């Protein structure tokens, strides 16, 4: 059965980007998916997006610009502390110059570079580059 909705949303975008398609449809929608998409959009990796109301959790249509190399999920939501975050970005990123880990923290869902300014740890959600 469907054990996790965020893993479907990112696998569906990742298969559409590799085929060269200009749009994709995500279903079901969730509060976690809308907050994750917003972090990719603010850094310039995807275009703007629209939500459809249907009285059953809803759907999203997203616009693609061709810049995204990958996006993905770490399935157990492991806890991270500021001293251990270096080991995770050494494992998951392609260079020290670009790409982002996404964390959930009591100050909000955010970019791993913002978590250092806000002096906060959290749980891992995923990444993009």
């Amino acid at each position: 059965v469907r054990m996790n909705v965020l893993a479907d949303a990112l696998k569906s975008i990742n298969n559409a980007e590799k085929r060269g398609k200009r749009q994709v449809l995500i279903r079901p929608c969730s509060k976690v998916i809308v907050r994750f998409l917003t972090v990719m959009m603010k850094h310039g990796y995807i275009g703007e997006f629209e939500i459809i109301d249907d009285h059953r959790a809803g759907k999203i249509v997203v616009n693609l610009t061709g810049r995204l190399n990958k996006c993905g999920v770490i399935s157990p939501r492991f806890d991270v502390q500021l001293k251990d975050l270096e080991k995770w970005q050494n494992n998951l990123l392609p260079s020290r110059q670009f790409g982002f880990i996404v964390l959930t923290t009591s100050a909000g869902i955010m970019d791993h570079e913002e978590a250092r300014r806000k002096h906060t740890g959290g749980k891992i959600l995923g990444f993009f580059f």
């Binding site: 398609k21 200009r22 749009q23 994709v24 449809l25 629209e50 249907d54 249509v61």
Partner: protein
């Protein structure tokens, strides 16, 4: 499907072709209609996929028979859909 068709504006002939649960937003294919018969003329309401053998207020023995799809009327004077 080409590489660039937009997903937010399907034409009504693209939407009417596909299954009721797989449309952009869901909608039934069934409907309500008003039905009338000879000999007694009090008009009555029926559902197009009925399971019941309907008897009218005019007390005729069968208004319609049930079936594996739409129910069939006993040559009644109306099959007119209600608009909403």
């Amino acid at each position: 499907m080409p590489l660039a068709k937009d997903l937010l504006h399907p034409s009504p002939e693209e939407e009417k072709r596909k299954h009721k649960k797989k449309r952009l937003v869901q909608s039934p294919n069934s409907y309500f209609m008003d039905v009338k018969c000879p000999g007694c003329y009090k008009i009555t309401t029926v559902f197009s996929h009925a399971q019941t053998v309907v008897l009218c207020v005019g007390c005729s023995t069968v208004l319609c028979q049930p079936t594996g799809g739409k129910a069939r009327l006993t040559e009644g004077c109306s099959f007119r859909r209600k608009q909403h």
